[PDB]
Amino acid sequence: SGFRKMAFPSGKVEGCMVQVTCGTTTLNGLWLDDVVYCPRHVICTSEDMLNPNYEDLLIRKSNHNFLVQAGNVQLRVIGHSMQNCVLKLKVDTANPKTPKYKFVRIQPGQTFSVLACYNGSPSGVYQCAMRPNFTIKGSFLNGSCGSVGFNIDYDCVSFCYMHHMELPTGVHAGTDLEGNFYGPFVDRQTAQAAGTDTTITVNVLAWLYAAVINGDRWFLNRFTTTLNDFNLVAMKYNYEPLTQDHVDILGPLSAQTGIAVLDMCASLKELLQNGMNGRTILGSALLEDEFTPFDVVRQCSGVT
Amino acid sequence: SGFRKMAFPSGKVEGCMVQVTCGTTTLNGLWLDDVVYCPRHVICTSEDMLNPNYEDLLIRKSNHNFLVQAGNVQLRVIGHSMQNCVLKLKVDTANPKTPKYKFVRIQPGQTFSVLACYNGSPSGVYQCAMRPNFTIKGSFLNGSCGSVGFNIDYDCVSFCYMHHMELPTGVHAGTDLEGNFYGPFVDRQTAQAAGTDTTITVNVLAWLYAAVINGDRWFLNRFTTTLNDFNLVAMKYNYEPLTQDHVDILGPLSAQTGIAVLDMCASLKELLQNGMNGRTILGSALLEDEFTPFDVVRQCSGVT
Protein backbone atom coordinates (compact mmCIF):
# COMPACT_ATOMS: atom_id res chain seq x y z
CA SER A 1 0.00 0.00 0.00
CA GLY A 2 0.92 3.70 -0.25
CA PHE A 3 0.92 5.76 -3.44
CA ARG A 4 3.82 7.86 -4.60
CA LYS A 5 4.72 10.05 -7.56
CA MET A 6 7.15 7.47 -8.90
CA ALA A 7 9.63 7.84 -11.72
CA PHE A 8 11.12 5.00 -13.79
CA PRO A 9 14.57 3.76 -12.69
CA SER A 10 16.96 6.08 -14.56
CA GLY A 11 20.04 3.87 -15.05
CA LYS A 12 19.37 3.08 -18.71
CA VAL A 13 19.14 6.79 -19.52
CA GLU A 14 22.07 7.83 -17.30
CA GLY A 15 24.30 5.66 -19.54
CA CYS A 16 23.27 7.83 -22.51
CA MET A 17 23.92 11.30 -21.11
CA VAL A 18 26.75 13.32 -22.57
CA GLN A 19 27.91 16.95 -22.53
CA VAL A 20 27.74 18.91 -25.81
CA THR A 21 29.59 22.24 -26.15
CA CYS A 22 29.56 24.55 -29.13
CA GLY A 23 31.41 27.81 -28.73
CA THR A 24 30.53 29.17 -25.31
CA THR A 25 27.28 27.15 -24.92
CA THR A 26 27.24 23.85 -23.04
CA LEU A 27 24.18 21.62 -22.68
CA ASN A 28 23.22 17.94 -22.53
CA GLY A 29 23.09 15.45 -25.34
CA LEU A 30 21.58 11.98 -25.63
CA TRP A 31 24.02 9.38 -27.04
CA LEU A 32 22.26 6.43 -28.72
CA ASP A 33 24.20 4.19 -31.10
CA ASP A 34 26.66 6.53 -32.95
CA VAL A 35 24.43 9.63 -32.81
CA VAL A 36 24.29 12.34 -30.13
CA TYR A 37 20.98 14.26 -30.07
CA CYS A 38 20.85 17.73 -28.60
CA PRO A 39 18.85 21.01 -28.86
CA ARG A 40 19.92 22.95 -31.94
CA HIS A 41 20.19 26.15 -29.80
CA VAL A 42 23.58 24.77 -28.63
CA ILE A 43 25.00 26.78 -31.63
CA CYS A 44 23.52 30.05 -30.31
CA THR A 45 24.91 32.74 -28.06
CA SER A 46 22.45 34.46 -25.62
CA GLU A 47 22.19 37.34 -28.18
CA ASP A 48 21.50 34.90 -31.08
CA MET A 49 18.42 33.60 -29.18
CA LEU A 50 16.47 36.85 -29.73
CA ASN A 51 16.04 36.12 -33.46
CA PRO A 52 18.07 33.05 -34.55
CA ASN A 53 18.33 31.84 -38.15
CA TYR A 54 19.47 28.32 -37.34
CA GLU A 55 20.35 27.38 -40.94
CA ASP A 56 22.60 30.47 -41.23
CA LEU A 57 24.18 29.91 -37.81
CA LEU A 58 24.82 26.25 -38.57
CA ILE A 59 26.72 27.15 -41.82
CA ARG A 60 29.46 28.68 -39.64
CA LYS A 61 29.87 25.38 -37.69
CA SER A 62 31.90 22.31 -38.62
CA ASN A 63 32.09 18.84 -36.94
CA HIS A 64 35.16 19.92 -34.88
CA ASN A 65 33.17 22.84 -33.34
CA PHE A 66 30.84 20.36 -31.52
CA LEU A 67 32.64 19.09 -28.44
CA VAL A 68 31.05 15.92 -27.10
CA GLN A 69 32.22 14.46 -23.81
CA ALA A 70 30.97 11.17 -22.33
CA GLY A 71 32.26 11.08 -18.76
CA ASN A 72 35.85 12.31 -18.92
CA VAL A 73 36.42 11.10 -22.51
CA GLN A 74 35.93 13.07 -25.72
CA LEU A 75 33.92 11.63 -28.61
CA ARG A 76 34.96 12.27 -32.21
CA VAL A 77 32.29 14.05 -34.27
CA ILE A 78 32.28 12.78 -37.86
CA GLY A 79 29.05 14.44 -39.07
CA HIS A 80 26.24 16.78 -38.09
CA SER A 81 22.74 17.50 -39.29
CA MET A 82 19.74 19.49 -38.14
CA GLN A 83 16.38 17.70 -37.86
CA ASN A 84 13.69 20.23 -36.94
CA CYS A 85 14.88 21.74 -33.56
CA VAL A 86 17.48 19.06 -32.73
CA LEU A 87 21.02 18.51 -33.92
CA LYS A 88 22.17 14.96 -34.65
CA LEU A 89 25.91 14.66 -34.15
CA LYS A 90 27.31 11.50 -35.69
CA VAL A 91 30.21 10.19 -33.61
CA ASP A 92 32.78 7.50 -34.48
CA THR A 93 31.85 5.36 -31.43
CA ALA A 94 28.56 3.59 -30.76
CA ASN A 95 27.43 4.06 -27.15
CA PRO A 96 28.27 0.75 -25.49
CA LYS A 97 25.50 1.42 -22.95
CA THR A 98 22.78 2.04 -25.60
CA PRO A 99 19.58 0.43 -24.29
CA LYS A 100 16.76 -0.95 -26.50
CA TYR A 101 14.97 2.28 -27.46
CA LYS A 102 12.21 3.99 -29.43
CA PHE A 103 11.37 7.63 -30.18
CA VAL A 104 7.75 8.34 -29.41
CA ARG A 105 5.63 11.49 -29.54
CA ILE A 106 3.26 11.52 -26.57
CA GLN A 107 -0.19 13.09 -26.31
CA PRO A 108 -1.21 15.66 -23.65
CA GLY A 109 -2.11 13.97 -20.36
CA GLN A 110 0.58 11.32 -20.74
CA THR A 111 3.22 11.03 -18.07
CA PHE A 112 6.96 10.40 -18.27
CA SER A 113 10.10 10.53 -16.12
CA VAL A 114 12.72 13.30 -16.57
CA LEU A 115 16.38 12.80 -15.78
CA ALA A 116 17.53 16.36 -15.10
CA CYS A 117 21.17 16.77 -16.17
CA TYR A 118 23.86 19.52 -16.17
CA ASN A 119 27.16 19.24 -18.08
CA GLY A 120 26.14 15.73 -19.16
CA SER A 121 25.80 14.59 -15.54
CA PRO A 122 22.55 13.46 -13.92
CA SER A 123 21.29 15.48 -10.97
CA GLY A 124 17.84 14.00 -10.39
CA VAL A 125 14.83 12.15 -11.61
CA TYR A 126 11.20 13.12 -11.33
CA GLN A 127 7.84 12.26 -12.80
CA CYS A 128 5.78 14.76 -14.78
CA ALA A 129 2.97 14.99 -17.40
CA MET A 130 2.64 16.64 -20.77
CA ARG A 131 0.07 19.36 -19.88
CA PRO A 132 -3.01 19.89 -22.13
CA ASN A 133 -1.39 23.26 -23.12
CA PHE A 134 1.78 21.29 -24.24
CA THR A 135 4.00 22.59 -21.48
CA ILE A 136 5.62 20.59 -18.69
CA LYS A 137 5.98 21.76 -15.11
CA GLY A 138 9.59 20.69 -14.63
CA SER A 139 12.53 21.64 -12.48
CA PHE A 140 15.16 22.93 -14.83
CA LEU A 141 17.99 25.44 -14.35
CA ASN A 142 20.41 26.94 -16.95
CA GLY A 143 22.40 24.13 -18.56
CA SER A 144 19.52 21.60 -18.19
CA CYS A 145 18.70 21.77 -21.92
CA GLY A 146 18.96 18.44 -23.67
CA SER A 147 17.76 16.59 -20.49
CA VAL A 148 15.21 13.96 -21.63
CA GLY A 149 11.83 12.53 -20.72
CA PHE A 150 11.16 8.85 -21.15
CA ASN A 151 9.06 5.82 -20.25
CA ILE A 152 10.34 2.23 -19.83
CA ASP A 153 8.54 -0.96 -20.88
CA TYR A 154 10.58 -3.84 -19.31
CA ASP A 155 13.95 -3.15 -21.10
CA CYS A 156 12.85 -0.72 -23.86
CA VAL A 157 13.30 3.02 -23.25
CA SER A 158 10.75 5.15 -25.14
CA PHE A 159 12.20 8.66 -25.30
CA CYS A 160 9.42 11.20 -25.61
CA TYR A 161 10.83 14.60 -24.61
CA MET A 162 13.99 16.67 -24.89
CA HIS A 163 14.16 19.86 -22.82
CA HIS A 164 14.67 23.09 -24.73
CA MET A 165 13.36 26.10 -22.90
CA GLU A 166 11.74 27.90 -20.05
CA LEU A 167 8.90 30.27 -20.90
CA PRO A 168 8.66 33.69 -19.12
CA THR A 169 5.99 32.06 -16.91
CA GLY A 170 8.41 29.46 -15.44
CA VAL A 171 6.87 26.52 -17.30
CA HIS A 172 8.84 24.34 -19.69
CA ALA A 173 8.75 23.57 -23.43
CA GLY A 174 10.61 21.05 -25.52
CA THR A 175 10.52 18.66 -28.40
CA ASP A 176 10.09 14.97 -29.12
CA LEU A 177 13.40 13.20 -30.28
CA GLU A 178 12.65 14.11 -33.91
CA GLY A 179 13.02 17.80 -32.89
CA ASN A 180 9.36 18.83 -33.18
CA PHE A 181 8.15 20.97 -30.29
CA TYR A 182 5.19 19.93 -28.25
CA GLY A 183 2.67 22.72 -28.72
CA PRO A 184 3.16 25.98 -30.58
CA PHE A 185 6.50 26.87 -29.03
CA VAL A 186 9.59 27.93 -30.95
CA ASP A 187 13.26 27.97 -29.89
CA ARG A 188 13.44 31.76 -29.70
CA GLN A 189 13.71 34.20 -26.76
CA THR A 190 10.40 35.87 -27.53
CA ALA A 191 6.96 36.41 -25.96
CA GLN A 192 5.50 32.94 -25.84
CA ALA A 193 2.58 32.54 -23.53
CA ALA A 194 1.01 29.19 -22.73
CA GLY A 195 -2.70 28.49 -23.14
CA THR A 196 -5.05 27.32 -20.37
CA ASP A 197 -3.57 24.68 -18.16
CA THR A 198 -6.60 22.46 -17.76
CA THR A 199 -6.77 19.44 -15.42
CA ILE A 200 -6.39 15.92 -16.91
CA THR A 201 -9.74 14.46 -15.84
CA VAL A 202 -9.00 10.82 -16.71
CA ASN A 203 -5.82 10.99 -14.59
CA VAL A 204 -7.67 12.51 -11.62
CA LEU A 205 -10.16 9.63 -11.84
CA ALA A 206 -7.35 7.07 -12.02
CA TRP A 207 -5.80 8.65 -8.90
CA LEU A 208 -9.23 8.56 -7.15
CA TYR A 209 -9.27 4.80 -7.94
CA ALA A 210 -5.68 4.53 -6.50
CA ALA A 211 -6.97 6.25 -3.35
CA VAL A 212 -9.82 3.72 -2.96
CA ILE A 213 -7.38 0.81 -3.56
CA ASN A 214 -5.12 2.27 -0.86
CA GLY A 215 -7.97 2.82 1.65
CA ASP A 216 -8.81 6.56 1.36
CA ARG A 217 -12.57 6.32 0.79
CA TRP A 218 -14.13 9.38 2.56
CA PHE A 219 -14.95 11.07 -0.81
CA LEU A 220 -17.07 8.18 -2.16
CA ASN A 221 -20.69 9.30 -2.23
CA ARG A 222 -24.14 7.79 -2.89
CA PHE A 223 -24.46 9.47 -6.32
CA THR A 224 -23.92 8.72 -9.97
CA THR A 225 -23.92 10.98 -13.07
CA THR A 226 -23.79 10.74 -16.88
CA LEU A 227 -20.86 11.66 -19.17
CA ASN A 228 -22.75 14.76 -20.39
CA ASP A 229 -23.74 15.94 -16.88
CA PHE A 230 -20.20 15.35 -15.57
CA ASN A 231 -18.69 17.19 -18.55
CA LEU A 232 -20.86 20.27 -17.89
CA VAL A 233 -19.21 20.45 -14.42
CA ALA A 234 -15.75 19.59 -15.81
CA MET A 235 -16.03 22.51 -18.31
CA LYS A 236 -16.84 24.90 -15.43
CA TYR A 237 -13.76 23.77 -13.47
CA ASN A 238 -11.28 23.82 -16.41
CA TYR A 239 -11.13 20.02 -16.48
CA GLU A 240 -10.65 18.19 -19.80
CA PRO A 241 -13.87 16.64 -21.19
CA LEU A 242 -14.16 12.94 -20.38
CA THR A 243 -14.85 10.68 -23.35
CA GLN A 244 -15.98 7.04 -23.70
CA ASP A 245 -12.32 6.24 -24.62
CA HIS A 246 -11.36 7.52 -21.13
CA VAL A 247 -14.17 5.48 -19.46
CA ASP A 248 -12.86 2.40 -21.38
CA ILE A 249 -9.31 3.06 -20.20
CA LEU A 250 -10.55 3.23 -16.56
CA GLY A 251 -12.32 -0.17 -16.94
CA PRO A 252 -9.68 -2.26 -15.10
CA LEU A 253 -9.64 0.20 -12.15
CA SER A 254 -13.46 0.18 -12.12
CA ALA A 255 -13.40 -3.68 -12.04
CA GLN A 256 -10.73 -3.85 -9.30
CA THR A 257 -12.67 -1.57 -6.95
CA GLY A 258 -16.22 -2.44 -8.00
CA ILE A 259 -16.91 1.30 -8.45
CA ALA A 260 -18.51 2.13 -11.80
CA VAL A 261 -16.67 4.88 -13.72
CA LEU A 262 -19.72 7.17 -13.70
CA ASP A 263 -20.08 6.72 -9.90
CA MET A 264 -16.45 7.86 -9.51
CA CYS A 265 -17.30 10.79 -11.82
CA ALA A 266 -20.11 11.75 -9.41
CA SER A 267 -17.66 11.66 -6.49
CA LEU A 268 -15.26 13.89 -8.47
CA LYS A 269 -18.20 16.24 -9.35
CA GLU A 270 -18.98 16.67 -5.60
CA LEU A 271 -15.29 17.22 -4.78
CA LEU A 272 -15.16 19.98 -7.41
CA GLN A 273 -18.36 21.59 -6.18
CA ASN A 274 -17.83 21.30 -2.40
CA GLY A 275 -14.04 21.28 -2.14
CA MET A 276 -11.99 19.04 0.16
CA ASN A 277 -13.18 20.77 3.41
CA GLY A 278 -9.63 20.67 4.82
CA ARG A 279 -9.36 16.92 4.14
CA THR A 280 -6.71 15.05 2.14
CA ILE A 281 -6.66 12.23 -0.44
CA LEU A 282 -3.44 10.18 -0.62
CA GLY A 283 -1.68 12.90 1.39
CA SER A 284 -2.79 15.61 -1.06
CA ALA A 285 -5.09 18.58 -0.45
CA LEU A 286 -5.75 18.98 -4.19
CA LEU A 287 -6.82 16.56 -6.93
CA GLU A 288 -3.70 15.01 -8.51
CA ASP A 289 -3.66 14.66 -12.29
CA GLU A 290 -0.12 13.45 -13.13
CA PHE A 291 -0.91 9.69 -12.81
CA THR A 292 -2.41 7.98 -15.86
CA PRO A 293 -4.68 4.93 -15.49
CA PHE A 294 -1.70 2.85 -16.75
CA ASP A 295 0.50 4.39 -13.99
CA VAL A 296 -2.04 3.52 -11.31
CA VAL A 297 -2.30 -0.12 -12.47
CA ARG A 298 1.52 -0.34 -12.84
CA GLN A 299 2.20 1.04 -9.35
CA CYS A 300 -0.59 -0.96 -7.73
CA SER A 301 0.60 -4.25 -9.43
CA GLY A 302 4.42 -3.92 -9.15
CA VAL A 303 5.56 -3.98 -12.78
CA THR A 304 9.39 -4.09 -12.96
CA SER B 1 12.82 27.50 -12.18
CA GLY B 2 10.17 25.01 -11.04
CA PHE B 3 10.39 22.79 -7.97
CA ARG B 4 9.83 19.06 -8.01
CA LYS B 5 9.96 16.16 -5.57
CA MET B 6 13.17 14.84 -7.09
CA ALA B 7 14.90 11.56 -6.42
CA PHE B 8 18.60 10.81 -6.99
CA PRO B 9 19.46 9.07 -10.29
CA SER B 10 19.07 5.36 -9.44
CA GLY B 11 21.58 3.70 -11.80
CA LYS B 12 24.26 3.11 -9.15
CA VAL B 13 21.74 1.30 -6.94
CA GLU B 14 20.05 -0.60 -9.80
CA GLY B 15 23.43 -2.31 -10.41
CA CYS B 16 23.29 -3.67 -6.85
CA MET B 17 19.80 -5.18 -6.80
CA VAL B 18 19.48 -8.93 -6.62
CA GLN B 19 16.74 -11.47 -5.85
CA VAL B 20 17.07 -13.54 -2.66
CA THR B 21 14.90 -16.64 -2.15
CA CYS B 22 14.81 -18.88 0.89
CA GLY B 23 12.25 -21.65 0.85
CA THR B 24 9.03 -20.18 -0.48
CA THR B 25 9.92 -16.51 0.33
CA THR B 26 11.45 -14.24 -2.30
CA LEU B 27 12.54 -10.66 -1.67
CA ASN B 28 15.24 -8.18 -2.70
CA GLY B 29 18.85 -8.10 -1.67
CA LEU B 30 21.56 -5.45 -1.98
CA TRP B 31 24.82 -6.80 -3.48
CA LEU B 32 27.88 -4.75 -2.46
CA ASP B 33 31.36 -6.26 -2.84
CA ASP B 34 30.95 -10.02 -2.03
CA VAL B 35 28.07 -9.57 0.43
CA VAL B 36 24.31 -9.59 -0.27
CA TYR B 37 22.25 -7.80 2.41
CA CYS B 38 18.61 -8.66 2.86
CA PRO B 39 15.85 -8.65 5.55
CA ARG B 40 16.27 -11.62 7.87
CA HIS B 41 12.51 -12.40 7.50
CA VAL B 42 13.43 -14.01 4.13
CA ILE B 43 13.80 -17.26 6.23
CA CYS B 44 10.20 -17.01 7.49
CA THR B 45 6.95 -18.41 6.19
CA SER B 46 3.78 -16.24 6.61
CA GLU B 47 2.95 -18.36 9.73
CA ASP B 48 6.49 -17.89 11.18
CA MET B 49 5.95 -14.09 11.12
CA LEU B 50 3.39 -14.21 13.97
CA ASN B 51 6.09 -15.06 16.54
CA PRO B 52 9.48 -15.74 14.87
CA ASN B 53 12.59 -16.87 16.76
CA TYR B 54 15.09 -15.86 14.10
CA GLU B 55 18.08 -17.60 15.72
CA ASP B 56 16.13 -20.89 15.86
CA LEU B 57 14.81 -20.52 12.30
CA LEU B 58 18.26 -19.68 10.98
CA ILE B 59 19.75 -22.92 12.51
CA ARG B 60 17.66 -24.90 10.00
CA LYS B 61 19.21 -22.96 7.05
CA SER B 62 22.50 -23.58 5.27
CA ASN B 63 24.30 -21.49 2.58
CA HIS B 64 22.70 -23.58 -0.23
CA ASN B 65 19.18 -22.69 1.04
CA PHE B 66 19.73 -18.98 0.12
CA LEU B 67 19.21 -18.59 -3.61
CA VAL B 68 20.71 -15.36 -4.90
CA GLN B 69 20.12 -14.30 -8.49
CA ALA B 70 21.69 -11.23 -10.13
CA GLY B 71 19.86 -10.76 -13.43
CA ASN B 72 19.51 -14.24 -14.92
CA VAL B 73 22.67 -15.61 -13.22
CA GLN B 74 22.91 -17.40 -9.89
CA LEU B 75 25.44 -16.33 -7.27
CA ARG B 76 27.20 -18.90 -5.09
CA VAL B 77 26.59 -18.41 -1.36
CA ILE B 78 29.70 -19.29 0.65
CA GLY B 79 28.60 -17.96 4.06
CA HIS B 80 25.74 -16.37 5.97
CA SER B 81 25.34 -14.39 9.15
CA MET B 82 22.63 -12.43 10.92
CA GLN B 83 23.38 -8.84 11.97
CA ASN B 84 20.43 -7.47 13.92
CA CYS B 85 17.43 -7.71 11.47
CA VAL B 86 19.46 -8.24 8.27
CA LEU B 87 21.14 -11.30 6.81
CA LYS B 88 24.56 -10.92 5.21
CA LEU B 89 25.07 -13.56 2.55
CA LYS B 90 28.70 -13.88 1.52
CA VAL B 91 28.96 -14.76 -2.17
CA ASP B 92 32.00 -15.95 -4.15
CA THR B 93 31.77 -13.01 -6.61
CA ALA B 94 32.30 -9.33 -5.88
CA ASN B 95 29.64 -7.17 -7.55
CA PRO B 96 31.43 -5.68 -10.56
CA LYS B 97 28.98 -2.75 -10.44
CA THR B 98 29.64 -1.94 -6.74
CA PRO B 99 29.67 1.87 -6.43
CA LYS B 100 31.64 3.84 -3.79
CA TYR B 101 29.36 3.43 -0.76
CA LYS B 102 28.73 4.06 2.93
CA PHE B 103 26.15 2.78 5.42
CA VAL B 104 24.58 5.66 7.29
CA ARG B 105 21.83 5.88 9.90
CA ILE B 106 19.71 8.96 9.22
CA GLN B 107 17.79 11.11 11.70
CA PRO B 108 14.03 11.84 11.47
CA GLY B 109 13.31 14.65 9.01
CA GLN B 110 16.05 13.55 6.62
CA THR B 111 15.12 12.65 3.08
CA PHE B 112 16.30 9.88 0.78
CA SER B 113 15.41 8.19 -2.52
CA VAL B 114 13.85 4.68 -2.61
CA LEU B 115 14.35 2.31 -5.51
CA ALA B 116 11.29 0.07 -5.22
CA CYS B 117 12.13 -3.44 -6.44
CA TYR B 118 10.35 -6.82 -6.90
CA ASN B 119 12.19 -10.09 -7.61
CA GLY B 120 15.47 -8.15 -7.68
CA SER B 121 14.21 -5.89 -10.48
CA PRO B 122 13.66 -2.14 -10.16
CA SER B 123 10.14 -0.85 -10.68
CA GLY B 124 10.45 2.79 -9.67
CA VAL B 125 12.19 5.52 -7.80
CA TYR B 126 10.70 8.10 -5.47
CA GLN B 127 11.75 10.56 -2.82
CA CYS B 128 10.60 10.28 0.79
CA ALA B 129 11.53 11.34 4.37
CA MET B 130 12.15 9.51 7.59
CA ARG B 131 9.07 10.69 9.58
CA PRO B 132 9.50 11.99 13.18
CA ASN B 133 7.65 8.79 14.29
CA PHE B 134 10.35 6.69 12.42
CA THR B 135 8.02 5.46 9.70
CA ILE B 136 8.23 6.20 5.98
CA LYS B 137 5.25 6.83 3.74
CA GLY B 138 6.37 4.64 0.85
CA SER B 139 4.80 2.75 -1.99
CA PHE B 140 5.54 -0.88 -1.37
CA LEU B 141 3.69 -4.07 -2.34
CA ASN B 142 4.38 -7.72 -1.32
CA GLY B 143 7.87 -8.70 -2.50
CA SER B 144 9.23 -5.12 -2.10
CA CYS B 145 11.16 -6.05 1.07
CA GLY B 146 14.87 -5.47 0.79
CA SER B 147 14.30 -2.40 -1.48
CA VAL B 148 16.68 0.35 -0.26
CA GLY B 149 16.77 4.05 0.51
CA PHE B 150 19.85 6.06 -0.29
CA ASN B 151 21.43 9.46 -0.92
CA ILE B 152 24.23 10.23 -3.42
CA ASP B 153 27.11 12.67 -2.92
CA TYR B 154 28.79 12.97 -6.38
CA ASP B 155 29.80 9.25 -6.83
CA CYS B 156 29.31 7.92 -3.26
CA VAL B 157 26.05 6.13 -2.44
CA SER B 158 25.07 6.43 1.25
CA PHE B 159 22.59 3.64 1.93
CA CYS B 160 20.33 4.59 4.81
CA TYR B 161 17.26 2.34 4.66
CA MET B 162 16.24 -1.21 3.84
CA HIS B 163 12.51 -1.95 3.59
CA HIS B 164 11.14 -4.57 5.94
CA MET B 165 7.48 -4.14 6.64
CA GLU B 166 4.13 -2.51 6.32
CA LEU B 167 2.31 -1.66 9.54
CA PRO B 168 -1.49 -2.28 9.82
CA THR B 169 -1.89 1.48 9.17
CA GLY B 170 -0.31 1.31 5.67
CA VAL B 171 2.88 3.11 6.68
CA HIS B 172 6.32 1.55 6.33
CA ALA B 173 9.11 0.45 8.68
CA GLY B 174 12.61 -0.75 8.04
CA THR B 175 16.19 -0.77 9.15
CA ASP B 176 19.49 0.94 8.41
CA LEU B 177 22.08 -1.38 6.57
CA GLU B 178 23.36 -2.66 9.92
CA GLY B 179 19.89 -4.20 10.49
CA ASN B 180 18.69 -1.86 13.25
CA PHE B 181 15.10 -0.69 12.80
CA TYR B 182 14.29 2.96 12.68
CA GLY B 183 11.97 3.53 15.62
CA PRO B 184 10.54 0.91 17.96
CA PHE B 185 9.42 -1.51 15.27
CA VAL B 186 10.17 -5.23 15.24
CA ASP B 187 10.07 -7.74 12.36
CA ARG B 188 6.97 -9.50 13.66
CA GLN B 189 3.35 -9.62 12.43
CA THR B 190 1.97 -8.05 15.58
CA ALA B 191 0.10 -4.92 16.72
CA GLN B 192 2.57 -2.15 16.08
CA ALA B 193 1.09 1.29 16.01
CA ALA B 194 3.05 4.37 15.02
CA GLY B 195 3.29 7.48 17.19
CA THR B 196 2.24 10.99 16.15
CA ASP B 197 3.27 11.90 12.66
CA THR B 198 4.35 15.47 13.26
CA THR B 199 5.36 17.91 10.49
CA ILE B 200 9.10 18.58 9.88
CA THR B 201 9.12 22.34 10.50
CA VAL B 202 12.64 23.03 9.20
CA ASN B 203 11.75 21.28 5.93
CA VAL B 204 8.52 23.28 5.54
CA LEU B 205 10.57 26.46 5.99
CA ALA B 206 13.13 25.30 3.42
CA TRP B 207 10.28 24.62 0.97
CA LEU B 208 8.81 28.10 1.71
CA TYR B 209 12.25 29.51 0.77
CA ALA B 210 12.17 27.35 -2.45
CA ALA B 211 8.76 28.89 -3.21
CA VAL B 212 10.12 32.45 -2.84
CA ILE B 213 13.16 31.57 -5.03
CA ASN B 214 10.74 30.20 -7.66
CA GLY B 215 8.41 33.25 -7.52
CA ASP B 216 5.48 32.12 -5.31
CA ARG B 217 5.43 34.99 -2.81
CA TRP B 218 1.73 35.57 -1.90
CA PHE B 219 2.23 34.10 1.64
CA LEU B 220 5.00 36.54 2.65
CA ASN B 221 3.61 38.89 5.28
CA ARG B 222 4.67 42.05 7.15
CA PHE B 223 5.30 40.16 10.43
CA THR B 224 8.12 38.59 12.36
CA THR B 225 8.13 36.31 15.45
CA THR B 226 10.58 34.78 17.96
CA LEU B 227 11.63 31.10 18.22
CA ASN B 228 9.60 30.71 21.44
CA ASP B 229 6.44 32.40 20.04
CA PHE B 230 6.68 30.38 16.80
CA ASN B 231 7.19 27.14 18.76
CA LEU B 232 4.02 27.75 20.81
CA VAL B 233 2.09 27.76 17.48
CA ALA B 234 4.11 24.83 16.09
CA MET B 235 3.22 22.73 19.18
CA LYS B 236 -0.50 23.47 18.60
CA TYR B 237 -0.28 22.32 14.97
CA ASN B 238 1.77 19.13 15.60
CA TYR B 239 4.86 20.69 14.02
CA GLU B 240 8.34 19.78 15.33
CA PRO B 241 9.90 22.48 17.56
CA LEU B 242 12.33 24.69 15.66
CA THR B 243 15.77 25.06 17.24
CA GLN B 244 18.70 27.46 16.67
CA ASP B 245 20.43 24.52 14.84
CA HIS B 246 17.51 24.60 12.35
CA VAL B 247 17.73 28.43 12.00
CA ASP B 248 21.50 27.99 11.34
CA ILE B 249 20.81 25.35 8.69
CA LEU B 250 18.36 27.73 6.93
CA GLY B 251 21.03 30.52 6.86
CA PRO B 252 22.02 30.10 3.17
CA LEU B 253 18.33 30.16 2.08
CA SER B 254 17.75 33.22 4.29
CA ALA B 255 20.79 34.94 2.63
CA GLN B 256 19.73 34.00 -0.93
CA THR B 257 16.24 35.47 -0.51
CA GLY B 258 17.01 38.27 1.95
CA ILE B 259 14.19 36.96 4.18
CA ALA B 260 15.25 36.50 7.81
CA VAL B 261 14.47 33.02 9.19
CA LEU B 262 12.17 34.42 11.89
CA ASP B 263 10.25 36.46 9.26
CA MET B 264 9.66 33.21 7.31
CA CYS B 265 8.55 31.64 10.62
CA ALA B 266 5.95 34.41 10.97
CA SER B 267 4.68 33.69 7.45
CA LEU B 268 4.43 29.97 8.34
CA LYS B 269 2.63 30.90 11.62
CA GLU B 270 -0.02 32.86 9.63
CA LEU B 271 -0.38 30.00 7.12
CA LEU B 272 -1.02 27.59 10.00
CA GLN B 273 -3.51 29.92 11.66
CA ASN B 274 -5.42 31.16 8.58
CA GLY B 275 -4.98 28.25 6.17
CA MET B 276 -4.24 28.56 2.45
CA ASN B 277 -7.70 30.05 1.57
CA GLY B 278 -7.91 27.84 -1.54
CA ARG B 279 -4.49 29.03 -2.74
CA THR B 280 -1.42 26.95 -3.65
CA ILE B 281 2.34 27.13 -3.01
CA LEU B 282 4.56 25.41 -5.60
CA GLY B 283 1.49 23.60 -6.94
CA SER B 284 0.60 22.28 -3.48
CA ALA B 285 -2.48 23.02 -1.35
CA LEU B 286 -0.70 21.86 1.82
CA LEU B 287 2.67 22.68 3.40
CA GLU B 288 5.30 20.25 2.04
CA ASP B 289 7.81 18.84 4.53
CA GLU B 290 9.79 16.23 2.56
CA PHE B 291 12.48 18.67 1.27
CA THR B 292 15.40 19.40 3.59
CA PRO B 293 17.27 22.73 3.44
CA PHE B 294 20.11 20.79 1.73
CA ASP B 295 17.61 19.46 -0.88
CA VAL B 296 16.34 22.96 -1.62
CA VAL B 297 19.88 24.33 -2.13
CA ARG B 298 20.85 21.23 -4.20
CA GLN B 299 17.81 21.49 -6.48
CA CYS B 300 18.03 25.27 -6.80
CA SER B 301 21.83 25.10 -7.64
CA GLY B 302 21.97 22.03 -9.93
CA VAL B 303 24.32 19.68 -8.09
CA THR B 304 25.09 16.61 -10.25
Ligand SMILES: O=C(Cc1cccc(Cl)c1)Nc1cncc2c1CCCN2
Ligand atom coordinates in the same frame (compact mmCIF):
# COMPACT_ATOMS: atom_id res chain seq x y z
O1 LIG C 1 15.40 28.69 -21.73
C1 LIG C 1 16.61 28.47 -21.77
C2 LIG C 1 17.50 29.09 -22.83
C3 LIG C 1 16.71 29.36 -24.09
C4 LIG C 1 16.26 30.63 -24.38
C5 LIG C 1 15.41 30.85 -25.46
C6 LIG C 1 15.02 29.80 -26.27
C7 LIG C 1 15.52 28.54 -25.99
CL1 LIG C 1 15.15 27.22 -27.07
C8 LIG C 1 16.34 28.30 -24.91
N1 LIG C 1 17.26 27.69 -20.88
C9 LIG C 1 16.68 27.20 -19.69
C10 LIG C 1 15.93 26.03 -19.69
N2 LIG C 1 15.29 25.57 -18.61
C11 LIG C 1 15.39 26.28 -17.48
C12 LIG C 1 16.13 27.46 -17.37
C13 LIG C 1 16.80 27.94 -18.51
C14 LIG C 1 17.62 29.21 -18.46
C15 LIG C 1 17.24 30.08 -17.29
C16 LIG C 1 17.05 29.31 -16.00
N3 LIG C 1 16.21 28.13 -16.17
Ligand SMILES: O=C(Cc1cccc(Cl)c1)Nc1cncc2c1CCCN2
Ligand atom coordinates in the same frame (compact mmCIF):
# COMPACT_ATOMS: atom_id res chain seq x y z
O1 LIG D 1 5.03 -6.46 5.68
C1 LIG D 1 5.42 -7.34 4.91
C2 LIG D 1 5.68 -8.76 5.37
C3 LIG D 1 6.09 -8.76 6.83
C4 LIG D 1 5.17 -9.09 7.82
C5 LIG D 1 5.50 -8.95 9.16
C6 LIG D 1 6.76 -8.49 9.53
C7 LIG D 1 7.67 -8.21 8.54
CL1 LIG D 1 9.30 -7.76 8.98
C8 LIG D 1 7.35 -8.32 7.20
N1 LIG D 1 5.62 -7.15 3.58
C9 LIG D 1 5.22 -5.98 2.89
C10 LIG D 1 6.04 -4.86 2.86
N2 LIG D 1 5.67 -3.71 2.29
C11 LIG D 1 4.46 -3.65 1.72
C12 LIG D 1 3.57 -4.72 1.69
C13 LIG D 1 3.96 -5.93 2.29
C14 LIG D 1 3.04 -7.13 2.29
C15 LIG D 1 1.61 -6.75 2.04
C16 LIG D 1 1.43 -5.73 0.94
N3 LIG D 1 2.34 -4.60 1.07
